[PDB]
Design a protein around this nucleic acid. Structure first.
Ligand code: MN
Ligand code: MN
Ligand code: MN
Ligand code: NA
Length: 347
DNA sequence: CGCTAGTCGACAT
DNA sequence: CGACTAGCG
């Protein structure tokens, strides 16, 4: 997530209602609804006690979209991307820590702080997501599990003309290159739409409204793939890309000391990490619903060599990718949990 | 001004 | 997997 990005391009936003997309298809980052729905029943999840509140919680939004004449495609997170594995490990550590700390604070009499701590121990499993999948198929709503991050999958679905908008709370989608992103959408249909074409309405951006320059800016500001340099946020990065009339980003990053008038020293780790980040934003593996094949988010440019993009995602046989995408195969144990078939009845 | 980083809402009773 | 704000350049 790009920290403070939404406030940064606030001028490119537009308070709309989902009715705007009536008779059209919209893909959804379901993790948001899953998380929020899981907050309501944090105790049950922390104790391991059975629950299904988040299911109905998601079904509220789903049935709402269906009521306003929208066709939603619920997209779920799949395998763990090696690029964002540090953050994953940290989040897991803090999850277990908050779990046990909650289990101990429950004994101090502070039931309030125990549940407050259980709110920060929410771990969205793939079983829950599968409950949501089945519940969605009950209403005939198409579901799709991304090979890796949901972000990339959604980005593909939006850039390939399969969907026109993306419902989410993550500003990461904008960096990937989504045309229209609906944020802050409530249970009634009220959300904030950000159109890429409106990026020109931002004075702070300047000539950084192109997808590539915008990507560079989002990366330099700090992302889940690469921590930003000490003292480099959105405005300074944007300033760099504004003042730099150079297609080669590498030399620019090397002369970041010259562009920003700051005595900046760039480690060798950061250049490689940057190339990694950009290659991850560009060529992260997604799943084509039509051709049923594992493809990168974008067409492989002749610049980069695909054999050095293992961090962007590893390939598998497209049948396995299909069985994962349908949610039939477990993301973790790789074992068959279901046997749903779209043939014998999006694709 | 601009950026880091730590706090705490989100659900909902 | 986010929106504030104190604290500092
Ligand atoms: Mn993120
Ligand atoms: Mn995501
Ligand atoms: Mn993300
Ligand atoms: Na930053």
């Amino acid at each position: 997530g790009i920290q403070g990005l939404l406030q940064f391009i606030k001028e490119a936003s537009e308070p709309i209602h989902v009715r705007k997309y009536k008779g059209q298809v919209v893909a959804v980052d379901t993790y948001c609804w899953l998380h929020k729905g899981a907050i309501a029943c944090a105790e049950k999840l922390a104790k391991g006690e059975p629950t299904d509140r988040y299911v109905g919680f998601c079904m509220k939004f789903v049935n709402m979209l269906l009521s306003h004449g929208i066709k939603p495609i619920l997209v779920f997170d799949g395998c763990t991307l090696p690029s964002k594995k540090e953050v994953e490990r940290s989040r897991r550590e803090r999850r277990q820590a908050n779990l046990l700390k909650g289990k101990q604070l429950l004994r101090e009499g502070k039931v309030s702080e125990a549940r407050e701590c259980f709110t920060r121990s929410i771990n969205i499993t793939h079983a829950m997501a599968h409950k949501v999948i089945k519940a969605a198929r009950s209403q005939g709503v198409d579901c799709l599990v991304a090979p890796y991050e949901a972000d990339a999958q959604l980005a593909y679905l939006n850039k390939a003309g399969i969907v026109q908008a993306i419902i989410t709370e993550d500003s990461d989608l904008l960096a990937f290159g989504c045309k229209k992103v609906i944020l802050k959408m409530d249970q009634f249909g009220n959300g904030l739409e950000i159109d890429q074409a409106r990026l020109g309405m931002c004075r702070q951006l300047g000539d950084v409204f192109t997808e590539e320059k915008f990507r560079y800016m989002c990366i330099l500001s700090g992302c889940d793939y690469l921590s930003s340099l000490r003292g480099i946020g959105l405005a300074k990065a944007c300033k760099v890309l504004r003042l730099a009339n150079n297609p080669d980003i590498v030399k620019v990053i090397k002369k970041i000391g010259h562009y920003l008038k700051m005595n900046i020293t760039v480690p060798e780790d950061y250049i490689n990490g940057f190339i990694r980040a950009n290659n991850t934003f560009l060529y992260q593996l997604v799943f084509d619903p039509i051709k049923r094949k594992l493809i990168p988010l974008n067409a492989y440019e002749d610049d980069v060599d695909p054999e050095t993009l293992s961090y962007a995602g590893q390939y598998v046989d497209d049948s396995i990718a299909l069985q994962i995408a349908l949610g039939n195969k477990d993301i973790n144990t790789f074992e068959q949990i279901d046997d749903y078939n779209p043939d014998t009845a999006l694709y």
